[PDB]
Design a binder for this molecule. Structure first.
Ligand SMILES: Cn1cc(NS(=O)(=O)N2CCC[C@H](C(N)=O)C2)cn1
Ligand SMILES: [Zn+2]
Length: 140
């Protein structure tokens, strides 16, 4: 589990969104595993506006923050699971690292702020859904 709190927005994995999230929906994209909903209180996270390929992520299955190298956001094939059929997930970045399904929501961050959240894993790799192109998150 886990979310990014920026201004009056809550950014979560779409496969983990609750009722309140869908009711107060701002934007969602199944092909990115992302969902943004409105909030009443202000969040304090800052989104990274950069092309960094190194950072640190939180792994709840290990209670540890790992420094990683990650690939640029791409269209990656993601096997079928209990949440989606086999499909291509867009804006996805991979790193060599440990993850389990319950790790989704863990923040990936660089010196500039939040880069994205854990979304995929398996085969000794961890996938993060990029949020750095979502410029509207800093305004309105
Ligand atoms: C973070 N993590 C997720 C997994 N397992 S997964 O890659 O099958 N994953 C299951 C939950 C939905 C994910 C998606 N975005 O399609 C795929 C392992 N580690
Ligand atoms: Zn950066």
């Amino acid at each position: 589990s886990g979310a990014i709190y920026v201004g009056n927005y809550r950014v979560v994995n779409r496969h983990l969104a609750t009722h309140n999230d869908w009711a107060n929906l701002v934007w969602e994209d199944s092909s990115r595993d992302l969902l943004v909903s409105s909030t009443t209180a202000q969040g304090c996270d800052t989104i990274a506006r950069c092309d960094c390929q190194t950072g640190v992520y939180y792994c709840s299955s290990r209670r540890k923050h790992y420094p990683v190298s990650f690939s640029k956001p791409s269209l990656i094939f993601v096997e079928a699971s209990e949440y989606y059929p086999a499909r291509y997930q867009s804006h996805l970045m991979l790193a060599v690292g440990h993850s389990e399904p319950g790790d989704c929501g863990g923040i990936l961050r660089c010196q500039h702020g939040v880069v994205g959240i854990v979304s995929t894993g398996g085969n000794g790799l961890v996938g993060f859904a990029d949020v750095r192109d979502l410029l509207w998150l800093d305004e309105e």
